[PDB]
């Protein structure tokens, strides 16, 4: 279809060509055979973690310390363990619970925070983006091209060979977007919108979830103890506010895109008459 058609170059050993998200290009000339050049695909290689959010916490290890009035600030001992989230509170007190003076007693409730599902955010750049470039002769074979090592010489045997310098510009603003992964569906979040979500988040290979309260409800106090729960899945209310992003497939540690194109110098010189 989009199979363009060019001609070597005015008595020269080169050609300057360009490809789209799909287009291929035939290059003809007197002496040398014709060479169908296609840009098969482009993928992101080995994406690194930048920040994964939680969307289904597990709350365990409850434990609420207390104190009447005139007994100061109740302090939960677990308040010394990072895994625990603690919210000092206040509750009615009186004779009915071992206090000689009706009034607001201190209270400190602690609970461990654990994550059950992470929305892992990843990043890419020049040092990892591949570019499939099939080459035919009229017998063929494909290969990949990076902004790091753009050129590539393909041995064609009895046909000859071809250098193929390149300039792998794309469409996406690299270092401006991220690869979000909610459940199985993968998406393309916009820079800030990502690190602007109100949810518990690990960092770079970190084991430290921050902004945790977001997912657990500290329920109505109760002289004795205080019930604490974790909120249901966010997957739902995360898909809902995330459909405008670009739906993609994170098939096997790689990413298929579309917004790409190459300007390549085809050194047909090495090609056999």
């Amino acid at each position: 279809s989009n199979r363009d058609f060019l001609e070597g170059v005015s008595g020269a050993t080169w050609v300057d060509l360009v490809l789209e998200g799909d287009s291929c290009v035939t290059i003809m000339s007197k002496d040398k055979p014709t060479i169908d050049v296609k840009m098969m695909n482009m993928e992101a290689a080995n994406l690194a973690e930048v920040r994964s959010y939680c969307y289904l916490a597990t709350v365990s290890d409850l434990s609420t310390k207390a104190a009447c009035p005139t007994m100061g600030e109740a302090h939960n001992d677990k308040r010394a363990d990072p895994a625990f989230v603690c919210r000092q509170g206040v509750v009615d007190r009186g004779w009915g619970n071992g206090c000689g003076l009706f009034g607001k007693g201190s209270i400190d409730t602690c609970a461990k925070f654990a994550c059950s599902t992470k929305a892992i955010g990843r990043t890419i750049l020049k040092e990892n983006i591949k570019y499939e470039v099939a080459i035919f002769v009229h017998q063929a074979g494909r290969f990949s091209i990076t902004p790091a090592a753009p050129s590539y010489t393909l041995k064609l045997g009895e046909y000859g060979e071809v250098t193929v310098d390149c300039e792998p510009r794309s469409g996406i603003d690299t270092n401006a977007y991220y690869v979000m992964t909610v459940g199985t569906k993968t998406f393309l979040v916009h820079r800030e919108w990502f690190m602007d979500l109100n949810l518990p988040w690990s960092s770079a290979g970190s084991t430290v979830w921050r902004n945790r309260e977001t997912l657990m409800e500290f329920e109505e106090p109760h002289a004795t103890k205080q019930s604490v729960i974790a909120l249901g899945s966010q997957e739902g209310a995360l898909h809902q506010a995330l459909a405008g992003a670009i739906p993609v497939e994170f098939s096997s540690n790689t990413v298929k895109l579309t917004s790409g194109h190459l300007k390549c110098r085809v050194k047909m010189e090495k090609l056999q008459l």
Partner: antibody, heavy 121, light 107 residues
Framework: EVKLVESGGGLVLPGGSLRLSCATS????????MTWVRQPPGKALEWLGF??????????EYSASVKGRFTISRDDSQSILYLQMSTLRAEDRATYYC????????????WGVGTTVAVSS | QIVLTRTGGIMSASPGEKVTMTCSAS?????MHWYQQKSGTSPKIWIY???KLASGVPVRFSGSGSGTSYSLTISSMEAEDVATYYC?????????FGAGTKLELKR
């Protein structure tokens, strides 16, 4: 440890006023209730009033002997206690103590030096 | 108001000797506290909720009491026990102290 140092004691005429201070340290002032107790030159020991903490709306309670005459205030920002005093007379002559309150069933644990209040012309 | 009339206004005790002061109350009561004041010093909490000994307090001291009758007892009198001892009531308002029991070492 704890520090309860009274201040603002002197001689005053039968009817005058005075504001007693209890500068504290070595603990979280706001957290605890607080009380004033006076000891007359006669050993007897009179509770005057206490004042709750922030979370208890600074609830206060006074003894029959101090209705109107005095009122207690808390400078939670600097761990300071005050006992504003007005229209003193013969009976108010004493040594005024400033103690914290504590325990499930309240008791005055850490008292202070005390401060001397004389009423005469 | 509930008045705490103390039994044993003043008393002497020979070292090693067991001592007992009484706190009589003009009305029922829940708990009773005891304070120790040594000449010059400001009071100190000593017995709280009838029988729980304050901290630092020697295990020699002890308190019993229920309703309107309460007492503290030194197991074996000793010089450092020389002081005045006051009882405080809590069950009612206002808060009340007793007159105090002066304790002297009979040396």
């Amino acid at each position: 440890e704890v520090k309860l140092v009274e201040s603002g004691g002197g001689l005053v005429l039968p009817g005058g006023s005075l504001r007693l201070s209890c500068a504290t340290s070595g603990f979280t002032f706001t957290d605890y209730y607080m009380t004033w107790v006076r000891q007359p030159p006669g050993k007897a020991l009179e509770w005057l009033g206490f004042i709750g903490n922030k979370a208890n709306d600074y609830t206060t309670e006074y003894s029959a002997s101090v209705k109107g005459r005095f009122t207690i205030s808390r400078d939670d920002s600097q761990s300071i206690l005050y006992l504003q005093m007005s229209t003193l007379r013969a009976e108010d002559r004493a040594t005024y103590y400033c103690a914290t309150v504590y325990g499930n069933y309240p008791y005055f644990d850490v008292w202070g030096v005390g401060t001397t209040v004389a009423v005469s012309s | 108001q509930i008045v705490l009339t103390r039994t044993g206004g003043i008393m002497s005790a020979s070292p090693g000797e067991k001592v007992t002061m009484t706190c009589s109350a003009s009305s029922s009561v829940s708990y009773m506290h005891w304070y120790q004041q040594k000449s010059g010093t400001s009071p100190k909490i000593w017995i709280y909720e009838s029988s729980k000994l304050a901290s630092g307090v020697p295990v020699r001291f002890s308190g019993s009491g229920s309703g309107t009758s309460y007492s503290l007892t030194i197991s074996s009198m000793e010089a450092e026990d020389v002081a005045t001892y006051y009882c405080q009531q809590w069950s009612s308002h206002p808060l009340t102290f007793g007159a105090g029991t002066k304790l002297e070492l009979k040396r």
